[PDB]
From Swiss-Prot, chain B:
The chain holds residues 432 to 830 of 840 of the full protein. V-ATPase is a heteromultimeric enzyme composed of a peripheral catalytic V1 complex (components A to H) attached to an integral membrane V0 proton pore complex (components: a, c, c', c'', d, e, f and VOA1). This is V-type proton ATPase subunit a, vacuolar isoform. Glycosylated. The lineage of its organism: Eukaryota, Fungi, Dikarya, Ascomycota, Saccharomycotina. Changing residue 255 to S: Reduces ATPase activity. Residues 56-103, 163-205, 261-281 are vacuolar. The chain crosses the membrane at residues 1-11, 26-55, 104-123, 142-162, 206-224, 236-260, 282-320. Changing residue 107 to A: Reduces assembly of V-ATPase complexes.
Curated annotation (Swiss-Prot), chain C:
It is found in: Endoplasmic reticulum membrane; Vacuole membrane. Residues 22-44 are cytoplasmic. This is V-type proton ATPase subunit f. It is a multi-pass membrane protein. Its main location: endoplasmic reticulum. GO terms for biological process: endosomal lumen acidification; Golgi lumen acidification; proton transmembrane transport; vacuolar acidification. The chain crosses the membrane at residues 1-21, 45-63. It comes from the Eukaryota. GO terms for molecular function: proton-transporting ATPase activity, rotational mechanism; RNA endonuclease activity. GO terms for cellular component: endoplasmic reticulum membrane; fungal-type vacuole membrane; Golgi membrane; proton-transporting V-type ATPase complex; vacuolar proton-transporting V-type ATPase complex; vacuolar proton-transporting V-type ATPase, V0 domain. Keywords: Endoplasmic reticulum, Membrane, Transmembrane, Transmembrane helix, Vacuole. V-ATPase is a heteromultimeric enzyme composed of a peripheral catalytic V1 complex (components A to H) attached to an integral membrane V0 proton pore complex (components: a, c, c', c'', d, e, f and VOA1). Accessory component of the V0 complex of vacuolar(H+)-ATPase (V-ATPase), a multisubunit enzyme composed of a peripheral complex (V1) that hydrolyzes ATP and a membrane integral complex (V0) that translocates protons. V-ATPase is responsible for acidifying and maintaining the pH of intracellular compartments.
Curated annotation (Swiss-Prot), chain D:
Residues 75-92, 153-156 are vacuolar. Keywords: Hydrogen ion transport, Ion transport, Membrane, Transmembrane, Transmembrane helix, Transport, Vacuole. It comes from Saccharomyces cerevisiae (strain ATCC 204508 / S288c). This is V-type proton ATPase subunit c'. GO terms for cellular component: cell periphery; fungal-type vacuole; fungal-type vacuole membrane; Golgi membrane; membrane; proton-transporting V-type ATPase complex; vacuolar proton-transporting V-type ATPase complex; vacuolar proton-transporting V-type ATPase, V0 domain.
UniProtKB/Swiss-Prot annotation, chain E:
The gene is VMA16. Keywords: Hydrogen ion transport, Ion transport, Membrane, Transmembrane, Transmembrane helix, Transport, Vacuole. This is V-type proton ATPase subunit c''. The record marks 90 as: Essential for proton translocation. Belongs to the V-ATPase proteolipid subunit family. One of its GO terms (molecular function) is P-type proton-exporting transporter activity.
Length: 38, 346, 63, 156, 195, 155, 314, 158, 158, 156, 158
């Protein structure tokens, strides 16, 4: 047992949803650039 | 695309004078480069066993499914023959239809790219022998022919050799070409499982010949100043581009997978929904979702997908073929003539 | 013109689909997701074939 | 079996030859690209000085070969079928950090020297031996990281 | 920017909370790397191989393509003579494609037992870091070839004085990508399929 | 459920289906928005090039179609009790057409905006524009090839 | 410089393609041998001007006409690049024009204070600096009145006739100095601090040279701000400014301003991921539209002695 | 065990890697800033072959302060070592790397801005290297601590 | 044990290293910041040398403030030391470190400005050194509390 | 035990160190921003230098506000102290440090304006000095709740 | 027991410290910002020297708003606190502090503009301090809830 709240399935679901949030937030930053500079 | 170009070819006299639009002179000056596309792509779609998204069931299959089965069980067909012209239609709807088509197309991409690279490369010998330059033959062609033929010809004759050896009645393990390639150069001996007898004593000989050629390619031309630099930027341009071009004929596989598979979903999302035993709702449904199929199919597949494919067949010629024999530039012919110039240019 | 050529393709493409359901072809009604009773889904695109033949001969009078 | 060789130990060995390769080719790229910016603002049109203005990019490609030798030498100790301890997994992680950040330092330093310096030992050929002697000290930061790598490879 | 210094306080407080209360061995990255599925690491290394390769390949393409389209407004012959700068930006994506095809062949279903064994964890870590090695080395070589092929576009405005020297450093960025390719082919060289 | 098929295993699949279309549609949006601002600034004074210069937004839309195919293909392989093996190949197909189709949609946006502003000052750039544009397009198709190849190993 | 080509890739590629249209030192030697304006037109069309006089006649080809067709061909290229820029570059190209409209409100006041016509005076006015209120300049001749009345809505609002000119121009050049160090990245930081400082230098030297207090009307952004401002403030004669200008190593022996500008401009193109290129092209092409005009004045009336005073570093 | 765990060479490996990463980040900062500064205005008077290389060779003395401690903590590493050994050679890697990071930080700033004024008068060489070895003794202070922490990673360790 | 655990030398090692690292970063901002100002002056620097090096020699003292405590903590650093010892010698290194960092932030920004007016007026030196003493006793207040934490780090530990 | 754990002197140690460091971070910014305005203005009036150390002296006396509590929290740390008297010892240190740091910033920002202004009117010195005293009793407000809080510490 | 744990004082200690720290930070911004404009005000009219003292002393009552709360929170601290009186102790003073932080932001930002234009009108003796008396009771609103919390802190604990 890794733990009982921070189990390894919650962690592997929360890392592939933090990586996809990282490449979401940077892609929204790139799209936001158009609004900020045009 | 034959009917798109055939119409132009059939009455070219009355299109020879017309309004001549911007995307209509481009579509008319290449009316034979569109007709010969759609005829070669009709022969290719007959070898791919490909009408719009489905297969032609016109020869007897070489895959015989077994006698009895239950509804909802996995079924493995047995080969009773070979299909005469093209892919079997027994590969349609199967779960591993991509594990055969991808391997076949990706080895077809290698074989048809190596043959186009060596037919184009032979032009160099066709015009180092016409210009009476025997120095360039022994300094550039033959050191590059040995290296190209060994590194990638040796790969190309082993697709055909693995395709010509039955690895299931001989009891031998079927090798891996990709694995075999990456241990010709990294630990040149030590085959995982062999392909033909007396392999390692020629599989390291090919490497030795190629390695001997890399000094030869560069040293021979200056030794027979400026040509030393011009050759030393030509050998390292020749060596790391042959490992780039052969990997860049995989676009043919990639765009053919992204056309066949994409169309196979464009059929499913419009036409195959509209089937059912319905009287009044269906005869409107399969008419509206047919005009949502044919219009969409022409728009996506024939125009956008088609333009994408004709710009890689333009790219294979501009960089993977004319690198090898199309040396230099020349001033164009462009003679002093009279043309009926427009008044619009003002 | 757009509906003439669209119905000229429509009649040819739809009818040969109706013949590839009426004959119970292996590539159309050979799955488990198949439209069952092929000669009953066939009359849906026999009537859909000839309603494009209606649009074809109706728009073939303005040519 | 071993307490000292747990099954997650190749994570830090492949993290080592990753950090030894990606970081080294990051520094190599900075040095080659940044000094090639400085080469692209020059005009020579003569032989024997083309082969003189290419010193920072053939000095930056050695930083990628410094990362190449370390990454190919700590991926030859990695195999799924023998004893691989946690100790040399930590040493190979530190070899990757040493070579990776030292070749990243050498690439940043020869890119920041070679972008203006190539424009100084060209069309002023009297301080060539000073700019190259700057680039020798600027290169050997990665050769320091390669020496401490090759000690840590034969130590673990 | 403030959230970086707020999740660093939490990591310090939760570290010293586990450490001071004798339970600092609960934050164990080893048991994390050993209870986690190897198909995660192997396919977040394949998909991030072709992912970061394409991200660097496209990063090179819009640098030197938007340079030589701007440079081709006056000299239009550059876009059919300096298209070799956008070849090597795109062979970066080819090198992340070849790794994907090779890596995929090592990606088979494993049994219930023999799932978290030595070789499966090995090839999970191996395809993870090798797909990061060839994905991020091709990301950097695509950016490098883009920013040095964009200086090939505004220097082919000048006729012939520099392109023979610029090409040498154009292909020096290709060699780095190739050397990154033959490292990921040796990181996962001894990695087996999932058994 | 069991050890092979837990309950969080279709999270990867569901996230992958969502990722395949949200990341391609973000890249196809950035491609459409920069090409559409290059078109609607170009054809203010040169309105007869309105059908040549629109090929960056058609080509950026093909990235969206590629993303759509991956989402449909892996939603056909979703399920409540699916193995965790097929969960991560649906997430690999998700973020391999995802983060590749957004970078390819970005590069169609910058190259297409530079092209449609460049192929109007000189029309000889229109052949040079699309051959760069195809390269920035098939990087999304290379992402799509990985996804199809990786979805071919589900069950 | 990996983020520059996103918004400024087509921009820099076309500006770097305009500096190859800057006709070189061999392109003036064959252009100083014409002796008629028709012949000059004939061989100016071979350059990257490219037959811009294809609509004017040849009998009536004035010296000014070439000065304003070559400058119109400059200015349509400038606001061709300007309306294709992002929020870090559209502002920078507006701040280029902000120093132009200071020379336009300096000329509209000294033209409308005397008995002159609006239309005739307006023709001489530079057209990159042009706001919609600028054709008026006639509500009052008071300096205080202009700010509230007409300059309140301009972008000159945060900034006797030459006194309020240097009062606008120093606050402008201070605001333009701390903008280019705030939002513009590293390869154009060292450019837009040194090139801009030079502009503060050869304006502050012209303060004391035109004055023969003065500490508030002098811009302080350059190399003469800390030390030479106090020495140049109390200089009443030409020898006081000659002794004060000897302290700087880059300005000693000069008291030759545009030659030092063009030599400082040829090194500005040596960077190639910077936005200082568009200022180097603007000041270089504005140089070579007064080089062509200086040649065409020596061709319109025969002055063959003083022709070779054109200055081209590119 | 308890005194000598299995993860005990993590802190030792981190310390050894840390000295090179920080020391060479600072030595590259010293070399990168000094070289640009030395050649900005000294294109005239071509008799300056060995004019100002003394900040560059002294950021190489910084980088060999990282190499000496890195080889010497690489000798102390071992598969069965204590946490105390790993802790005090993490502190002996951090002190050299961070201290010589600051040392090359100081060398870079001094070199970059102090070589421009030299071009007008060569009498800056007397006072330059006097205030430029105070920046280098910051690294020798870092090595003294590391080399004295390293002298206790074996004295009564069990 | 429970009073002297195995992670107890981690605080001491970081603490001992921190004094050198933090003090050097202040002495490097004192040296680099003051150093550029001295180098820039050239017409009076060789006439008035040994009076512009008092910022960089006062800043240098801060580094030896962190050295005299980092050697003094490294003597009491041991394997089986109490956790109280590691706590108040991490507190010793953090006190002398971040107060020497404050006293290097002061001398760096105070000292460069002083040179500027020293070139314009030679009667600024006595007004500069008086401020630059209050900016250096600020580092000594961290030293006379670091050595006082260190005077009772092994008083009655168990 | 429970009321007096082993990790209790971490709190006191942090408090003793934070008080000296935070307060002298504020006394640094107080002597920084004032002394950068002092030595830049004495070139015009060299006789009035001794009435411009009064921003610096106040900052130097908040640095002994931080020391006179950090020498007095060090007097009662102990191997075995209660967790209450570790909690308020960081309480006292934080109270004198972060308040004192703010006090330093107030003196520095207010002081810089006053020294520069002082060259125009000698009557402004009595006004500027008075405002500064108000911004330094904020440091003594931090010292009252540093000393009073500290005093209770060892009652149980 | 669980109602009166051992980590209960820390919340209370933070409350006592927070009231002094947050309010002082607000007051320091209310003093530095308000008196930064004295040079402009007194270079033209030195008669308004006794008007800048008002926003300074209005922030001085803001500072003793937190000094009263922090010396009334300190009298209710104890080793064996309940956990409930820890949370009110944290709440009392968290509010006085962060609302005196807002009241010192408001006073120091309107006393700047009230004195930047006060030289042009001698009839702003009431209108400036009428804005100040609303911006200064924003901290009194924090105090009269910090004393209602502190009245409830030890009222019925067990």
């Amino acid at each position: 047992i890794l733990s009982s709240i921070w189990t390894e399935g919650l962690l592997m679901c929360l890392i592939v949803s933090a990586l996809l949030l990282f490449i979401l937030i940077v892609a929204l930053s790139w799209i936001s650039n158009l609004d900020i500079t045009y | 695309m034959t009917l798109a170009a055939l119409s132009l070819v059939l009455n070219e006299k009355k299109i020879n004078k017309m309004k001549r639009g911007e995307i209509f002179d481009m579509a008319f000056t290449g009316r034979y480069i569109i007709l010969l596309m759609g005829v070669f792509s009709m022969y290719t779609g007959f070898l791919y066993n490909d009408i719009f998204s489905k297969t032609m069931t016109i020869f007897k299959s070489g895959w015989k499914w077994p006698d009895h089965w239950k509804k909802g069980e996995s079924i493995t067909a047995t080969s009773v023959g070979t299909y005469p012209i093209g892919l079997d239609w027994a590969w349609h709807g199967t779960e591993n239809a991509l594990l055969f088509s991808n391997s076949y197309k990706m080895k077809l991409s290698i074989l048809m790219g190596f043959i186009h690279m060596t037919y184009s490369y032979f032009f160099s010998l066709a015009n180092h022998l016409y210009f009476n330059s025997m120095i360039d033959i022994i300094g550039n062609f033959i050191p590059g022919l040995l290296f190209m033929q060994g590194i990638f010809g040796y790969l190309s004759v082993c697709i055909v050799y693995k395709w010509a050896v039955d690895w299931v009645k001989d009891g031998k393990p079927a090798p891996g070409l990709l694995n075999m390639l990456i241990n010709m150069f990294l630990s040149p001996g030590t085959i995982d499982d062999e392909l033909y007898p007396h392999q390692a004593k020629v599989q390291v000989f090919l490497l030795l010949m190629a390695l001997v050629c890399i000094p030869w390619l560069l040293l021979v031309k200056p030794l027979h100043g400026d040509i030393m630099i011009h050759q030393v930027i030509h050998t390292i341009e020749f060596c790391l581009n042959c490992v780039s071009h052969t990997a860049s004929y995989l676009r043919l596989w990639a765009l053919s997978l992204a056309h066949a598979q994409l169309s196979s979903v464009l059929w499913t999302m419009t036409i195959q929904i509209a089937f059912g035993f319905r009287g009044f709702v269906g005869v409107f449904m399969t008419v509206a979702l047919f005009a949502m199929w044919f219009a969409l199919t022409c728009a996506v597949l024939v125009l956008m997908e088609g333009t994408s494919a004709m710009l890689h067949s333009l790219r294979l010629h501009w960089v993977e073929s004319m690198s090898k024999f199309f040396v230099g530039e020349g001033l164009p012919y462009e003679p002093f003539a009279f043309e009926y110039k427009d008044m619009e240019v003002a | 013109w757009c509906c003439t050529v669209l119905s000229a393709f429509g009649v040819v493409i739809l009818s040969v689909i109706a013949h590839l359901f009426n004959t119970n072809h292996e590539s159309f009604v050979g799955s488990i997701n198949d439209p069952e009773d092929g000669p009953a889904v066939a009359h849906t695109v026999y009537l859909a074939a000839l309603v494009y033949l209606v649009f074809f001969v109706f728009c073939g009078f303005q040519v | 079996s071993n307490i000292y060789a747990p099954l997650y130990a190749p994570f830090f060995g492949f993290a080592g030859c990753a950090a030894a390769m990606v970081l080294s080719c990051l520094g190599a790229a900075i040095g080659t690209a940044k000094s090639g910016i400085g080469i692209a603002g020059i005009g020579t049109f003569k032989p024997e000085l083309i082969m003189k203005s290419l010193i920072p990019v053939v000095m930056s490609g050695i930083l990628a070969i410094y990362g190449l030798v370390v990454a190919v030498l700590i991926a030859g100790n990695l195999s799924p079928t023998e004893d691989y301890t946690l100790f040399n997994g930590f040493m190979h992680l530190s070899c990757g950090l040493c070579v990776g950040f030292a070749c990243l330092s050498s690439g940043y330093a020869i890119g920041m020297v070679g972008d203006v310096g190539v424009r100084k030992y060209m069309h002023q050929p009297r301080l060539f031996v000073g700019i190259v002697l700057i680039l020798i000290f600027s290169e050997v930061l990665g050769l320091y990281g390669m020496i401490v790598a090759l000690i840590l490879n034969t130590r673990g | 920017h403030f959230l970086y210094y707020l999740v660093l306080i939490v990591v310090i407080v939760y570290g010293l909370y586990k450490l001071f209360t004798g339970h600092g061995s609960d934050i164990n990255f080893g048991k994390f790397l050993l209870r986690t599925s190897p198909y995660m690491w192997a396919n977040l290394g394949i998909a991030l191989c072709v992912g970061l390769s394409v991200v660097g390949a496209a990063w090179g393409i819009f640098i030197t393509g938007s340079s030589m389209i701007g440079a081709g407004v006056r000299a239009p012959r550059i876009t059919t003579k300096n298209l070799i700068s956008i070849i090597f930006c795109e062979v970066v994506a080819i090198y992340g494609l070849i790794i994907a095809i090779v890596f995929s062949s090592k990606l088979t279903v494993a049994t219930a037992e023999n799932m978290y064994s030595k070789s499966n964890l090995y090839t999970g870590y191996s395809l993870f870091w090798a797909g990061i090695t060839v994905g991020a080395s091709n990301l950097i070589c695509g950016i490098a070839v883009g920013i040095t092929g964009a200086t090939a576009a505004i220097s082919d405005a000048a006729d012939s004085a520099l392109f023979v020297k610029i090409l040498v450093i154009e292909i020096f960025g290709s060699i780095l990508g190739l050397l990154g390719l033959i490292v990921g082919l040796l990181m996962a060289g001894k990695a087996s399929e999932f058994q | 459920m069991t050890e092979l098929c837990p309950v969080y295993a279709p999270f990867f699949g569901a996230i992958g289906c969502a990722s395949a279309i949200i990341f391609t549609s973000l890249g196809a949006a950035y491609g459409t928005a920069k090409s559409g601002v290059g078109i609607c600034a170009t054809c203010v004074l040169r309105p007869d090039l309105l059908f040549k210069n629109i090929v960056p937004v058609i080509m950026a839309g093909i990235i969206a179609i590629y993303g759509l195919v991956v989402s449909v293909l892996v939603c056909y392989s979703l399920g409540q009790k699916q193995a965790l093996y097929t969960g991560f190949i649906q997430l690999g197909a998700g973020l391999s057409v995802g983060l590749s189709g957004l970078a390819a949609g970005f590069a169609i946006g910058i190259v297409g905006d530079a092209g449609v502003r460049g192929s109007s000052q000189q029309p000889r750039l229109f052949v040079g524009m699309i051959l760069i544009l195809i390269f920035a397009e098939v990087l999304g198709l290379y992402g799509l090839i990985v996804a199809l190849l990786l979805n071919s190993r589900a069950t | 410089g990996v983020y520059f080509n996103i918004d400024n890739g087509f921009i820099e590629g076309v500006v770097r393609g305009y500096r190859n249209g800057l006709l070189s030192n061999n392109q003036y030697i064959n252009l100083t041998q014409c002796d008629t304006l028709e012949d000059l037109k004939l061989q100016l069309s071979s350059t990257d001007y490219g037959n811009f006089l294809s609509s004017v006649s040849s009998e009536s080809l004035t010296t000014s006409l070439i000065q304003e067709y070559a400058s119109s061909k400059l200015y349509h290229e400038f606001n061709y690049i300007r309306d294709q820029s992002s929020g870090s570059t559209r502002k920078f190209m507006d701040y280029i024009t902000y120093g132009y409209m200071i020379d336009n409100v300096a000329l509209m006041i000294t033209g409308t204070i005397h008995d002159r016509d609006k239309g005739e005076i307006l023709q001489r006015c530079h057209p990159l600096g042009w706001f919609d209120t600028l054709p008026t300049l006639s509500v009052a001749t008071d300096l205080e009145s202009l700010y509230e009345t007409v300059l309140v809505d301009t972008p000159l609002a945060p900034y006797n006739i030459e006194i309020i000119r240097n009062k606008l121009y120093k606050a402008y050049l201070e605001d333009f100095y701390n903008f280019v160090t705030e939002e513009i990245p590293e390869p154009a930081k060292e450019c837009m601090q040194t090139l801009l400082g030079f502009e503060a230098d050869r304006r502050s030297i012209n303060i004391a040279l035109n004055s023969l207090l003065k500490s508030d009307l002098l811009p302080n952004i350059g190399k003469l701000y800390p030390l030479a401002t106090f020495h140049l403030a109390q200089a009443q004669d030409f020898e006081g400014v000659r002794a004060a200008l000897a302290n700087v190593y880059e300005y000693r022996g000069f008291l030759h301003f545009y030659q030092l500008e063009m030599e400082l401009c040829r090194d500005a193109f040596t960077q190639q991921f910077a936005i200082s290129t568009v200022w180097a092209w603007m000041k270089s092409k504005e140089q070579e539209v007064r080089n062509i005009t200086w040649i065409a004045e020596c061709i319109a009336q025969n002055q063959r002695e003083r022709i070779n005073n054109y200055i081209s570093v590119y």
